[PDB]
Write a protein that binds this ligand. Sequence first.
Ligand SMILES: Nc1nc2c(ncn2[C@@H]2O[C@H](COP(=O)(O)OP(=O)(O)O)[C@@H](O)[C@H]2O)c(=O)[nH]1
Ligand SMILES: Nc1nc2c(ncn2[C@@H]2O[C@H](COP(=O)(O)OP(=O)(O)O)[C@@H](O)[C@H]2O)c(=O)[nH]1
Ligand SMILES: [Mg+2]
Ligand SMILES: [Mg+2]
Lengths: 169, 169
Amino acid sequence: GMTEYKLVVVGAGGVGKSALTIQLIQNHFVDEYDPTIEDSYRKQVVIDGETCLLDILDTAGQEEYSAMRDQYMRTAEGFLCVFAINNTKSFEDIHHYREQIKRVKDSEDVPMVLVGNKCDLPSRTVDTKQAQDLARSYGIPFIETSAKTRQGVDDAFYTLVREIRKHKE
Amino acid sequence: GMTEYKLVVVGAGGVGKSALTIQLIQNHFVDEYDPTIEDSYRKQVVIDGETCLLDILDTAGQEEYSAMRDQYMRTAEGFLCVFAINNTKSFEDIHHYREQIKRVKDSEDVPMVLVGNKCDLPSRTVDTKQAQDLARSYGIPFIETSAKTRQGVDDAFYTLVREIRKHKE
Ligand SMILES: Nc1nc2c(ncn2[C@@H]2O[C@H](COP(=O)(O)OP(=O)(O)O)[C@@H](O)[C@H]2O)c(=O)[nH]1
Ligand SMILES: Nc1nc2c(ncn2[C@@H]2O[C@H](COP(=O)(O)OP(=O)(O)O)[C@@H](O)[C@H]2O)c(=O)[nH]1
Ligand SMILES: [Mg+2]
Ligand SMILES: [Mg+2]
């Protein structure tokens, strides 16, 4: 049937993983989303003229057991690694998330996008060059996003889908 | 195996995409064809003395998933972009369709014809020069048609096929 793409959003708490998911799914910005809510979202889209379904797991803290986490991490085809451009710690924490994906997927070639969220905020502590440099080093795309403005949210998810398509071609 | 040309008709609802297809297929003008109906038509024709088959998808621009739509947009060889000369909005909407075509065909060199329909009407708000100028900008032909009078309907479709023949030359 219709192609399904299983995506997982990873990153340090507070970077805007839920705001980005919900912007994509529900086309609105939520100012408060309880940190501990972990859940998956399905949305039909058209990417480069291809009608497909995005199956997205919005991840929370790595403390608590999630039955959903097990299946997705196992079966996921693509990952958004999200940092916040006003959170230096979160950008420093990116290599971790990527090394955990490689280990769980037992593979050095997992489709991934590097996402710098909160581009709507005027004091960046993580600049464009540093983000471009990391992504280049990983051989993945970097996309600047605002969950509040919708800036580049579609771009990030569509770029991961395109990255998955190339992993099969 | 007889040569098949897969054509897709695109444009804003109400420009006469269905009227033009049915004029070509059934050699009559239909005043009432459900705006939301999308389907494909196959018709044997003779172009410049070549007996070929036209496989045309008359698009309705609907939301629900259609495997046939996806197949046609991916496998198509040529596109009619249709506006109505008494519909300024529809001519303004032409760039959107061309950009969708570029994205799905993964190319900036896709056989295309710009079609200005309803030249039987005296209330023209989109003049010949502006249509010629857009087509020149895109590097494609512009053809004036009337589904009701059957003016240039054959010309529109046969012009697209010739454009496809040159792409494959
Ligand atoms: N200005 C701004 N605030 C954002 C953005 N994304 C998330 N936020 C806010 O940052 C906080 C954390 O967002 P949340 O989605 O809970 O983060 P998560 O735990 O990483 O999923 C909330 O107050 C959000 O409203 C963004 O792009 N811009
Ligand atoms: N006068 C005139 N009316 C037309 C012409 N082509 C279509 N129509 C009418 O305009 C409307 C739109 O036609 P339709 O085929 O439904 O457009 P579509 O939605 O683009 O497929 C219908 O009421 C048609 O009868 C034309 O060349 N001249
Ligand atoms: Mg959250
Ligand atoms: Mg129609």
